[PDB]
Design a protein around this ligand. Structure first.
Ligand SMILES: CCc1c(C(=O)NCc2cccc(Cl)c2)[nH]c(C)c1C(C)=O
Length: 116
């Protein structure tokens, strides 16, 4: 039941988020919230009830919204799962999502062993 200072959480986790955000071009579809009206996908919020993206996660990390590291990890998988759920497996975004998830696994694994 260890408690982490918000600042130490940000320090430990931010490099993993940076690694995802910097991944080009695979991060591009995940750098901002999905905007259904712009994209012409009006059923999006019927399928995805809990939208998530890298900018939102970044904000949560900056503003003390995570009490413990698994909450960050939860949001990352929420983001990936939303994309795997909504998009066809052949789609560009699905494929980018999978590649990003592999980057995430490599970066996160040592951090979370070293943390919680
Ligand atoms: C298909 C819509 C979508 C995007 C997206 O941003 N597309 C536009 C785009 C902009 C730049 C680069 C690319 Cl490749 C696509 N993003 C997500 C998570 C999704 C979904 C539904 O899951």
């Amino acid at each position: 039941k260890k408690i982490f200072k918000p600042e130490e959480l940000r320090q430990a986790l931010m490099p993993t988020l940076e690694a995802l955000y910097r991944q080009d071009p695979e991060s591009l579809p995940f750098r901002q919230p999905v905007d259904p009206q712009l994209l012409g996908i009006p059923d999006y919020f019927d399928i995805v009830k809990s939208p998530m993206d890298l900018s939102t996660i970044k904000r949560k990390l900056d503003t003390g919204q995570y009490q413990e590291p698994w909450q960050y990890v939860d949001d990352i998988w929420l983001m990936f799962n939303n994309a795997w759920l909504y998009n066809r497996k052949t789609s560009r975004v699905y494929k980018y999502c999978s590649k990003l998830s592999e980057v995430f696994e490599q970066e996160i694994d040592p951090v979370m062993q070293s943390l919680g």
